[PDB]
Design a protein around this ligand. Structure first.
Ligand code: HEM
Ligand code: HEM
Ligand code: HEM
Ligand code: HEM
Lengths: 145, 141, 141, 145
């Protein structure tokens, strides 16, 4: 994964991340901004506007959950793959979410991280976090092969 | 094509962008070279090292076009059309990169304009860039 | 946006597809689903055993669909739109898939027209199918 | 990845595969069909038209070169990380090629074989190539990740 000096950077930084609320807004931000995504989330309720989504209570709790996986992936960078085993099965082989979309969410996450933390999330941090989401793109993708 | 609501939403957000067009240009520029190193290859003659003369020129020339785009949205096919000639026949840029700058911008806005960067706005800058991008890649086809 | 060669290529090729289209669209899909399984969720209704006249009657209106688009090459924006909205607003089809269909369609023309599938053709038809996909996404709302 | 019936199916086929002309046609094709691939093949000569690189000798020659290196791994479908370790390297740190183009030439090769083999190259058949081309691809992309 990452030069252990690099790890200490993605790590020292998650320390100050309010995973909860990033979580809500991430999934929302994705749902609003990559409409097709919705389709997999249509048991959630009404997602017909911005507000619909950003407000919807389901979106919110399903987001705390989806940063948890990260907050969690973070603990175990060195073997993302393994740590992700199950979720990787869940998405691929009975949800059937094309892996392009682990990226998209990957990225939106970044975008929400940059909003939360300003120019404090420098590009040297971000260059890091973008592997972290590239890698969490990689573990969730696996069972496609 | 872009919904009226979006159109309005750029102008605002990029209205904010303000006299800062080409700092944010150099900032998206540089977030992209690091988080996507591959993309350096296209810019060989540069001195990419932080805040480098020439990146800042690219910083601005880019962001100035974007600007000119934010001008006439109804015709992005045309007011960018010169750049589609270059970017594809002279340079030949693999499309993938276009997203990567796109993404680069999206962030950079957020780093500096949290409060304007609402979701319906983020949705928007994007639909704008995805827009932008295609224009710049018309000629591959 | 295309050429004249291009159009003259799409055409002839698709005239040498001719009354086969229906039987080929057919094939298109079978390869598609069978190669990239995740295209089968877009059809939970479907019988997906070889032949299923569900499949067959579909490969057709795809081919009737395209046949319409080959015909109106000089303006795909308009003639298609009706189809675009559905494939997005309704269906909500992760744009990624049309890359997977184009390719299937070709591989399908590929063994059905060797002494026809010269580079420029493969260059034209792909290119063609690019615009078709890039219409059925035009409305990314 | 590759069942007992798969791992053979392909190589009973591959056996009848004219490995040599395919690559040269495959190649000009990535090149004719997808202009932005020409940046890396600058120093190759006239490419200015399909004819050019449908008859260009280095193309012709690098076509096969690739295929061998392809078709060797066709015979190695267990360890591709391995087989492609320092091809993955040359293509990443050196040539610096965007992973998608793998998937391109990939597909493209599949079209090639499906012109050379007609009705004979069934939906069954290629469905199996799909996850070889794609197989070979994450291999070539490893020495980024
Ligand atoms: C890297 C991104 C993702 C991570 C880390 C992730 C992780 C998770 C987690 C922790 C759960 C809950 C576990 C459970 O309830 O069984 C879950 C469920 C789910 N995920 Fe994601 N997921 C990701 C991306 C996606 C994407 C992109 C989609 C759709 C495009 C998606 C669709 C779903 C659905 C439909 C469920 C179940 C919803 C429900 O139970 O009501 N996931 N995923
Ligand atoms: C938002 C997308 C982009 C915009 C708005 C944009 C804007 C511009 C403009 C207006 C120019 C011409 C300035 C001049 O005439 O000297 C330019 C030059 C150039 N662009 Fe882009 N560009 C974009 C994306 C990209 C990307 C992603 C790459 C590659 C990663 C790229 C590669 C180049 C190169 C190599 C030059 C030549 C500059 C030189 O060597 O002097 N462009 N860009
Ligand atoms: C080559 C581009 C495509 C064309 C020309 C096309 C054409 C059409 C047409 C005309 C219809 C409905 C009309 C009728 O039944 O009378 C339809 C329905 C549909 N298509 Fe395709 N489509 C394309 C791409 C795709 C792709 C890539 C997918 C997913 C992999 C897809 C999945 C569907 C679905 C889920 C429906 C509605 C289900 C149904 O008919 O019962 N389409 N398409
Ligand atoms: C699809 C599977 C691919 C295979 C099997 C492959 C294989 C190879 C091989 C075997 C070599 C020769 C190593 C040597 O120098 O001794 C090579 C070099 C090279 N590869 Fe590929 N590669 C693949 C994909 C790509 C793609 C997609 C591109 C770009 C679009 C590319 C660009 C190059 C270039 C420019 C060279 C150096 C040739 C020269 O000296 O001009 N490769 N590759």
């Amino acid at each position: 994964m990452l030069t252990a000096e690099e790890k200490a950077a993605v790590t020292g930084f998650w320390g100050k991340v309010k995973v909860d609320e990033v979580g809500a807004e991430a999934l929302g931000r994705l749902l609003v901004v990559y409409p097709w995504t919705q389709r997999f989330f249509e048991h959630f309720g009404d997602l017909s506007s911005a507000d619909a989504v950003m407000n919807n209570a389901k979106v919110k709790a399903h987001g705390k959950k989806v940063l948890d996986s990260f907050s969690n992936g973070m603990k175990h960078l060195d073997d993302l793959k393994g740590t992700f085993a199950q979720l990787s099965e869940l998405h691929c082989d009975k949800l059937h979410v094309d892996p392009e979309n682990f990226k998209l969410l990957g990225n939106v996450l970044v975008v929400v991280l940059a909003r939360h933390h300003g120019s404090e999330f420098t590009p040297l941090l971000q260059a890091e976090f973008q592997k972290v989401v590239a890698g969490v793109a990689n573990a969730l993708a696996h069972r496609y092969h | 094509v872009l919904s009226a609501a979006d159109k309005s939403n750029v102008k605002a957000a990029w209205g904010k962008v303000g006299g800062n067009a080409g700092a944010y240009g150099a900032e998206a520029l540089e977030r992209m070279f690091l988080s996507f190193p591959t993309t350096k290859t296209y810019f060989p003659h540069f001195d990419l090292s932080h805040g480098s003369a020439q990146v800042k020129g690219h910083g601005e020339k880019v962001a100035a076009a974007l600007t000119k785009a934010v001008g006439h949205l109804d015709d992005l096919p045309g007011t960018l059309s010169d750049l589609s000639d270059l970017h594809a026949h002279k340079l030949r840029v693999d499309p993938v990169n276009f997203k990567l700058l796109s993404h680069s911008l999206l962030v950079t806005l957020a780093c500096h304009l949290p409060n304007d960067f609402t979701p319906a706005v983020h949705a928007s800058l994007d639909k704008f860039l995805a827009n932008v991008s295609t224009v710049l890649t018309s000629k591959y086809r």
